[model samples]
Target: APRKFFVGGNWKMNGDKKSLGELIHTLNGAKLSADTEVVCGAPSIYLDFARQKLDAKIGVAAQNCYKVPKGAFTGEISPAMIKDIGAAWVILGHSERRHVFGESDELIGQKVAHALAEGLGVIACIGEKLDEREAGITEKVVFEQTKAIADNVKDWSKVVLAYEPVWAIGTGKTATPQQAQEVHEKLRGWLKTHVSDAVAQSTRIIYGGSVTGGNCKELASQHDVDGFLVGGASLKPEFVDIINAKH
Candidate 1:
């Protein structure tokens, strides 16, 4: 089966209720390409609200979710709870989650395992920092981050791996299409070797970091770049442009 092109918007602490309403209206009316799969991330408070107001075809995703179904883990929302609230997906292991929040690989792996088991699709992110890339350890860092998930995850169908270079995430600097393809191709090759050929070919490995309307088409043209995990640009009307890039 051909991998479906996927795009996810990481709202990431941006947008208020009124703005979300407007954004949803914008997306609800946009003419997205038929082959594209979209999952819009919203803060916890907007999960149900966004899901309810947005076009039914536009899947809503939780920005984050706890591993367990239910617990006394204060300030945390569980996968089951997110599902009940109508979110179809949960974004785990995002660069911000890993770096700013200081979540470890094992912790993210645990979350991925539990979230998948609880019936939520996961956009699992993995990439290297500027220092690692500069030090020529990008491979080592990316591999280690993904290995953690591979060790704990059981289903590849419900998971989309996002490769976001930490240096480019919000820096307005994107990996050249060649650079993104090189990493994604190698990452898929690693999956073929360690996991299974079925997974290597079937799973959608996407790119992130400074993705915008102007640069999306070139990035989308790469064989290994199935789609994107959009950040800042996702908030603007240009996100419609990015979503329709395949056209």
Candidate 2:
């Protein structure tokens, strides 16, 4: 079967209950495309709230989760808790979580493994920084990050690989469609070689980094570009257009 179009909105730490409630109302009321699979990565505090408010078709995701199911990790929500709350997915190794919070590849891999083991779908992210791209090591950097996550994964069915370049994220610098396509293609090839051909063909390899409704159509037109992991634009009403980009 062809890979399903998957769009994830990483809300980050940006919304209060009232604002998110309104956003959820907007999403629920919007005429979304049936061909695309949509999920909102709500802040952990609002995971349950978003899940309850959102239509079942529009799945809810936690922006981050701990590597362990339960422990003395203060201020961290585990995948167990996320599942118990009914949110079906978790966004792991986002650029902010990598750079700002100093998450290592190994840690992100562990989180991905744990999230899947706990029965939640995982949006596992990987990408290179501006300097890495400038140094002509974008493939090396992204592939290495991906290798870590891939090594920990036993089931590719629940994993959606997100290619969100660190330099493009939240910097208002969107990757050109060609650039995004090039990387996504390479990543898929990586999966084919390192994992298996079937897993490579089936896994949803999504792009993130300043994605907006205005540009999503062109991005979605690429051969390997399955969908988006939207940042700022995901919070707005235009996200409906992004979700419907395949149309």
Candidate 3:
């Protein structure tokens, strides 16, 4: 089977109740592509609200979740809590979570393992920093990160690998289609060698980092570029265009 084009919106610490409610209204009413799988990553506070208010066709995802079901970990939410709210997905190992919150690959692996164990689909993110890219170790950096994620993934069907280069994220700089495709193709090959041919062919390898309406079509044209993990564009009405890029 062909990989379904997947577009995930990472609202990312933005939106109040009023604004997010309006965004949900817009999304619910939009004529989305039937072939695309759309999932919105809302802040944990609004996961339930987004799930209830949004149309059932569009899936709701938590921006983050803890590795354990329940624990004394204050200020942490478990995957069990995410599932209880009716959210079917969680975005793990995001750039902000890794860089801003100092989350290591080991921790992300644990989170992915437990999230999958709890039956929530995981958007497992892996990317390279500007320094790493500049040093020409982009492949090495991303491969190591992906290995961490792959180590814990018992079910590749429940995972969507998002490659969001740290430098491109929120910097108003998008990777050229060639650059994004290069990494994505390599990642697929990595999956083939390390995981399995089925996983390499079936998994949706989406791109992130400064993805916007203007560039989405060009990016979507790439063979290995299966979809997007959108940021700012996702908050606005233009997100509809991004969602329909494959159309």
* Candidate 3 Cα outliers beyond 4 Å, as residue runs: 170-174
Deviating ranges (above 4 Å) for candidate 1: 169-174
Ten residues in sequence with the least summed lDDT for candidate 3: 167-176
Candidate 1 residues 1-247, lDDT tens each? Answer: 9899999998999898899899898999999998999999999988989988989989889988887887789999999888887888999988888888999999999999999898999999999988788899988999999899999878899999999888665555656889899999999999999999999999999887668888999989999999999989888889999999976
Candidate 3: clashing pairs of residues:
none
TM-scores of the candidates are: 0.97, 0.97, 0.97
* Cα misplacement distance, residue 222 of candidate 2 (Å): 0.6
Which residue pairs of candidate 1 clash? none
Error of 1 at 172 (Å): 8.4
TM accuracy, model 1: 0.97
Taking the tens digit of each residue's C-alpha lDDT, what string does model 2 give over 1-247? Answer: 9889999998988999999999899999998888899999988878888889999999889999998877899999998899898999999998888989999999999898899888999998898988788799999999999999999999999999998877665556656889989999999999999989999999999988667878888889899998889988988999998899987
| RMSD (CA, Å), each prediction | 1.2, 1.3, 1.2
Candidate 3, residues 1-247, lDDT tens digits: the string is 9899999999999998899999898999999999999999998889999988989999999999988998899999999999898999999999889999999999999999999998999999999988788899999999999999999998899999999878665566656789999999999999999999999999999998667889999999999999999999989989999998998
Model 1 C-alpha lDDT versus the unseen true structure: 0.90
Cα-based lDDT at residue 38, candidate 3: 96
